[PDB]
């Protein structure tokens, strides 16, 4: 009589507990610096903050009972200790019998794993507290957080396809918008890199936080270009020409992404390289064809940041902000970047 996702969650945590197992404890104690007490501080901190936000109402989200909060939290903790053990056991240093103290002392990894466990639980129960509610509450940078998602998916095989689909979609949210906000640690990472934005060829062939991020971004945008180039079949020659203008705005106009959506720049790219090329001026016709994509929503092309200071639509964003920046690159097409 339980839902499939809730039943699946039962089978996963069955017989386990919200404390580290004996194997995990052995792995903690083999470290020169034993993480166990710091790991407990973090879960206790996250736990208190979670319950506080869970039980306190806002305009958007009504607060709920503390009994349910503890239930959700206890369940997430159980997942955390199961997944952490699996992660540590399968680690290369573990198999080679090397000290893991450095790996286990990174706070951002433990905070992210615990938040992702909370998100799995909330999703299983079809919580009204919708991502990114959990990382907002816990003060987690999207730019740091998303990295844990791949780890979770590969480290827990008991996750249903639906759980896995959801985790992939919240990763896409981070890549398309959330990691690009003005307060994001992304801009800090770009800054220490001397504002050098990795090109497609460079990360698709580096390997820092920046490169791994842009690798994901470039992969996501290419998939969302391909499908849209299956709308008007275009040609695989032009799908490269359009991928070039989009890469140009990412690398040489990174500010245009700030507080914006990846698809806004990809669509704006589309219309322009069409109009300057033999295959030409495919109109907002592709916007209706953009609606077919899973992540497509009205607010994307209806509501676009201009300056902030009001907020206009995609075509106003384009002619105000975009052409000014992208014209002189695009006009020259009266090189080509490789398409993944």
């Amino acid at each position: 009589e339980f839902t499939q996702s809730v039943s699946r969650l039962q089978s996963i945590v069955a017989g386990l507990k919200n404390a580290p197992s004996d194997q995990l404890i052995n792995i903690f104690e083999s470290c020169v610096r034993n993480p166990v007490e710091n790991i407990m501080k973090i879960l206790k901190g996250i736990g208190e903050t979670f319950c506080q936000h869970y039980t306190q109402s806002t305009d958007e989200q009504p607060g709920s009972h503390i009994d349910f909060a503890v239930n959700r939290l206890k369940l997430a903790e159980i997942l955390y200790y199961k997944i952490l053990e699996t992660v540590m056991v399968q680690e290369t240093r573990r198999l080679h019998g090397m000290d893991m103290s450095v790996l286990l002392e990174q706070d951002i990894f433990h905070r992210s794993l615990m938040a992702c466990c909370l998100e799995i639980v909330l999703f299983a129960y079809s919580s009204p507290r919708t991502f990114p509610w959990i990382i907002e509450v816990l003060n987690l940078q999207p730019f740091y957080f998303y990295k844990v998602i791949e780890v979770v998916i590969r480290s827990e095989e008991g996750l249903s396809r639906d759980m896995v689909k959801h985790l992939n979609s919240i990763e896409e949210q981070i890549l398309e918008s959330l990691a690009w906000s003005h307060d994001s640690a992304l801009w800090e990472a770009l800054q220490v890199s001397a504002n050098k934005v990795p090109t497609c060829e460079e990360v698709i062939f580096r390997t820092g936080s920046l490169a791994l991020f842009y690798r994901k971004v470039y992969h996501l945008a290419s998939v969302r270009l391909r499908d849209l180039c299956l709308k008007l079949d275009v040609s695989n020659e032009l799908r490269r020409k359009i991928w070039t203008c989009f890469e140009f705005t990412l690398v040489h106009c990174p500010d245009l992404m700030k507080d914006r959506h990846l698809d806004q720049l990809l669509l704006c790219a589309f219309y322009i390289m069409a109009k300057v090329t033999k295959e030409e001026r495919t109109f907002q016709e592709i916007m209706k064809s953009y609606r077919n994509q899973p992540q497509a929503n009205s607010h994307v092309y209806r509501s676009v940041l201009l300056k902030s200071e009001e907020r206009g639509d995609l075509i106003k964003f384009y002619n105000t902000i975009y052409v000014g920046r992208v014209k002189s690159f695009a006009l020259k097409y009266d090189p080509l970047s490789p398409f993944p």
Binding site: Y271, K275, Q284, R302, I315, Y318, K327
Partner: peptide
């Protein structure tokens, strides 16, 4: 050259 101004069809209904 270049701006193509237009009106987004008033929507979604």
């Amino acid at each position: 050259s270049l701006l193509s101004f237009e009106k987004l069809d008033r929507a979604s209904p």
